[PDB]
Design a protein around this ligand. Structure first.
Ligand SMILES: O=C(O)C1=C[C@@H](OP(=O)(O)O)[C@@H](O)[C@H](O)C1
Length: 427
């Protein structure tokens, strides 16, 4: 199959202008499609997950244009809930930010639509979301395995008292929050117990406010939403650079810099993954913050033992950076790594051992003890963009590394290797 071999990188130094945020891009596209008026999004991400959302909007009848590089999008808002009948099938690849939000949104009014995706998406849970939507009136059918896509949506979500489990994915709550304002009746969303990935809820609420809707957030345990609302175009909107994509470059400087500056995110960014920079600082790197950049300069790199529930995606980057740190690194409270692009606890542990690390794969944590020296490995990537990007950091050592299916990075970052190469220096 396809593979890419990375030769040892002696030093990293430079500036990277970040690709747009996947989380912000897919929320902005769905809200722009539901809104009244024309929205012009700039710095939109061009990646597989965004392309699946754009294709779904096209299939649903939404009109929009894209610039040549697909980072500028002018969307003609539908002025209300989207509609299609005839069991129209929307293929959503493995994009949670399209699958979860559309599963909720398309329950408004009457519809007859099927949502499906790649084989792995049919193994990613959606039951907590379906349960909540049904409590609000939605008619939803599991076409294959109970609690997983594919789903046949027949509409009916009117609002009301809705409980939702927040212990497995914050995306279910995000989907409900974006949908409820357009339901005819008021909705009170009650979180059953724990809520994981809380920072992503703040991104959702930030986007909803940009599009003209606010709700009452009672300590992230209950959300009061008034029905009969409408989203309104914000005119022009600048999508933040992606803070998760930024993690690889900031970590590379922490290991082998040099100073690497990423632009497009800064201290005021809404993305919780900017907190990844705080972890590098705790490990010994030097961080500089700007309005529109974050930079990292090599310092020391010491192991850490931290709860990473607030940054599940960027936390994977600490798992390979740990190969270069002094001591044993432990990342805790990351159970849902198991239900994402792949089971990331199994995948990360398996591949880390291949380059020499001693790894304890905990049920919901990972403990990593680096080897005295890394060895060569051909890294399996599990159709997971982050496995490829995280293991690219192995090349910041004296050994090359071969990454299988490097194009899997296109889920969120098609140009990843060219960008890592931009900051890679031989001297
Ligand atoms: O809402 C979002 O944009 C995302 C939320 C997170 O999912 P969980 O809430 O399932 O952790 C994250 O891992 C995913 O890549 C993007």
């Amino acid at each position: 199959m396809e593979s890419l071999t990375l030769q040892p990188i002696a030093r990293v130094d430079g500036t990277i202008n970040l690709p747009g945020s996947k989380s912000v891009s897919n929320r902005a596209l769905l809200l722009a499609a539901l809104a009244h008026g024309k929205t012009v999004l700039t710095n939109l991400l061009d990646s597989d997950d965004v392309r699946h959302m754009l294709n779904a909007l096209t299939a649903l009848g939404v009109s929009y244009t894209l610039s040549a590089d697909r980072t500028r999008c002018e969307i003609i808002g539908n002025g209300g809930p989207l509609h299609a009948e005839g069991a129209l099938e929307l293929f959503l690849g493995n994009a949670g930010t399209a699958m979860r939000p559309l599963a909720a949104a398309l329950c408004l009014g009457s519809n007859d639509i099927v949502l499906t995706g790649e084989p792995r998406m049919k193994e990613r849970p959606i039951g907590h979301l379906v349960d909540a939507l049904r409590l609000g009136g939605a008619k939803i059918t599991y076409l294959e395995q109970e609690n997983y896509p594919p789903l046949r949506l027949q509409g009916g979500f009117t609002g009301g008292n809705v409980d939702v489990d927040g212990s497995v994915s914050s995306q279910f709550l995000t989907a409900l929050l974006m949908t409820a304002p357009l339901a005819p009746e008021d909705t009170v969303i009650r979180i059953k117990g724990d809520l994981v990935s809380k920072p992503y809820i703040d991104i959702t609420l930030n986007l909803m406010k940009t599009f003209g809707v606010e709700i009452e957030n009672q300590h992230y345990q209950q959300f009061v939403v008034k029905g009969g609302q409408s989203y309104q175009s914000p005119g022009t909107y600048l999508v933040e650079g992606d803070a998760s994509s930024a993690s690889y470059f900031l970590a590379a400087a922490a290991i082998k810099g040099g100073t690497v500056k990423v632009t497009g995110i800064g201290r005021n960014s809404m993305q919780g993954d900017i907190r990844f920079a705080d972890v590098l600082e705790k490990m010994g790197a030097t961080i500089c913050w700007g309005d529109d950049y974050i930079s990292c300069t090599r310092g020391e790199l010491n192991a850490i033992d931290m709860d990473m529930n607030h940054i599940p995606d960027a936390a994977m980057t600490i798992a390979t950076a740990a190969l270069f740190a002094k001591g044993t690194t432990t990342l805790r409270n990351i159970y849902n790594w198991r239900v994402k692009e792949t089971d990331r606890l199994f995948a990360m542990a398996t591949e880390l051992r291949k380059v020499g690390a001693e790894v304890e794969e905990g049920h919901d944590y990972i403990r990593i003890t680096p080897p005295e020296k890394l060895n060569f490995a051909e890294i399996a990537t599990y159709n997971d963009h982050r496995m490829a990007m995280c293991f690219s950091l192995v090349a910041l050592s004296d050994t090359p590394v071969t990454i299988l299916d490097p194009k899997c990075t296109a889920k969120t970052f098609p140009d990843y290797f060219e960008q890592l190469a931009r900051i890679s220096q031989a001297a």
